[PDB]
Amino acid sequence: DPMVSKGEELFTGVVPILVELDGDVNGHKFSVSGEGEGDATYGKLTLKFICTTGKLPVPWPTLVTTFLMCFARYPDHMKQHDFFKSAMPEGYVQERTIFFKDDGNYKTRAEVKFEGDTLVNRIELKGIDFKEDGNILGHKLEYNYNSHNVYIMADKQKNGIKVNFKIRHNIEDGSVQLADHYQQNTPIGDGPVLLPDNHYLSYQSALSKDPNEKRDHMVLLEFVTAAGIT
User: How many CA atoms within 13 Å lie on the side-chain side of 42?
Assistant: First the structure.
């Protein structure tokens, strides 16, 4: 498949990754830069993020889903369903609303595209209607992360996809903070893209810290594999 070849071909080895985020949550402004690498053959991503403005005013686990689905491992038998890669190098827009249960919401807009050999994720985030002393602005979420399926369907009319999933963030008291994700992606270029049958991505994410790093930061390791089409 001379299409599967093209995007495939852009992702067959280790690819450098840059991430930039500009954020405002209830007027608390912040910026984050991230670097690392993706290896889509194994569904593997290794990333480190730095708050460049000082203290991050929301919990790092809240930004995991915002901070690269083109690095998912699609089984050979499902390569016709990989929208993300098909959209490259010109890229795609990823928009979300993230509804924190009994709290505020993030709205994000990201452009994911190649800049030379580097895969870049540029993000604008706005959060509103958060509680002062709630789980997010009150920093009550644990520094950990649960494994999660992400469900993908075609959105024929935006020539793209829609994505939906729930994340449960562990709260320091032993309870959980639901973060209900609604997502849409659309290609940036006018070139043909793959429009998938319904399927899911399985994600596992591990969070850590760099023992030499004194700035507020997060180290993220993610494994991601497409399935649900046997």
Answer: 11
Q: Pick from 190, 167, 162, 169: which is nearest to 95 by CA? A: 162
Q: Is 148 helix (H, G, I), strand (E, B) or coil?
A: strand
- Judge whether 146 and 176 are in contact, CB under 8 Å: no
Question: Which technique was the structure solved with, according to the deposited record?
Answer: X-ray
Domain count for the chain = 1
Inter-residue contact 195 to 227 (CB < 8 Å): no
DSSP designation for 190? S
The CATH number of the domain where 129 resides is what? 2.40.155.10
- For residue 187, the one-letter residue type is P
Resolution, given in Å to one decimal, reads 1.7
Structure tokens at 103: 């709290």
Q: What is the domain extent for residue 214?
A: 1-230
